[PDB]
Every structure is written in C-alpha cells, then in structure tokens.
Amino acid sequence: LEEHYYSRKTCGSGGGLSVQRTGYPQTDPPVFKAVNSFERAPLIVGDHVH
RNA sequence: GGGGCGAAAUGGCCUAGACCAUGCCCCUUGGCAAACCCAUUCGACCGGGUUUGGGUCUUCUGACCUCGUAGUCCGCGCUCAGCGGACUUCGACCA
C-alpha cells in the first residue's frame, strides 16, 4: 500500500487547491524463511559414573 | 617490666578459717621461598642489600580465576562437550 496526493491546479481562472488522496497496493518479494530445528539421539543406560 | 599462685616445697596461723615469708608458672616471638647486585686468582667465598610471595576486573562496595570450611537436599536421569552433580555460607603470607 502506498498513498499519494494528486494535487492538480486549474487553468487561469479561480485558483483552487484540491488534495485528492489515493492509495495503491504495492507488491514485494516474499519474507524470509526462518529456520529453527534440532535433532538428537534417544536415551541409553541409567548408570552415572561411566 | 607486665602478671599468677597460694596453691605445690616447706616456716608464722595452724578445730576451722583466711592471710603471710622465702618461694615457685609464662612474654620477651618467631618463619618466609624465589629472582638480581658488588671487588676479585679481575666470582667461587662467606657475608650483606633490592624486587616479588594466593591473584586480577573498577583488588571502592561487587564480581572473575582458585581452592579451604562447613549445612542442605541430592541422581538413581536428563543432557551436543556430558557426568556423578546440585544449591546457600565464612576464610584465604604462614605457626
């Protein structure tokens, strides 16, 4: 989205000011590809000293 | 100098008792372990002096290496290092 004021002026008669606000949806490349993973082994043995 | 004692050795007093005389108990603190210096056979030779000695970051409070001292639950499992590991405390040149 991007707004803009197409502010035009008339010929040699009057002299008024018009804002004329308008927007336009603007494209863009995709967002990052966040990655957060983790792999490990299961579980082995209960002994502690070894 | 500083204290202690009437015990403990005896003598006065000496049912008992508490004090006395000589009379006997301690302090004159102590130790650092390293590195370097002189004159010369122009080092061998004993003796002396200087820099360090738990240690840094803000050695201010307070923490970061290390340990020492204790009390408490503790694991009978979860974590890549692994592990046996947790929390709270006081001290840290040496007798």
Instruction: Using the CA of A41, give the nucleotide whose C1' is nearest.
Output: B80
Give how far Cα A19 sits from Cα of A9, A12, A13, A22, Å.
Answer: 10, 19, 18, 9
Asked if residues A18 and A7 have their Cβ atoms less than 8 Å apart, the reply is yes
A17 CA → B54 C1’, Å: 84
- Chain B positions within 7 A of any protein Cβ atom are 75-80, 82-84
CA triplet A21, A26, A30: central angle to 5 degrees? 155
Experimental method: cryo-EM
C1' (B67) to CA (A44) span, angstroms: 35
CA distances from A43 to A4, A38, A39, A40, A46 (A): 62, 16, 13, 10, 9
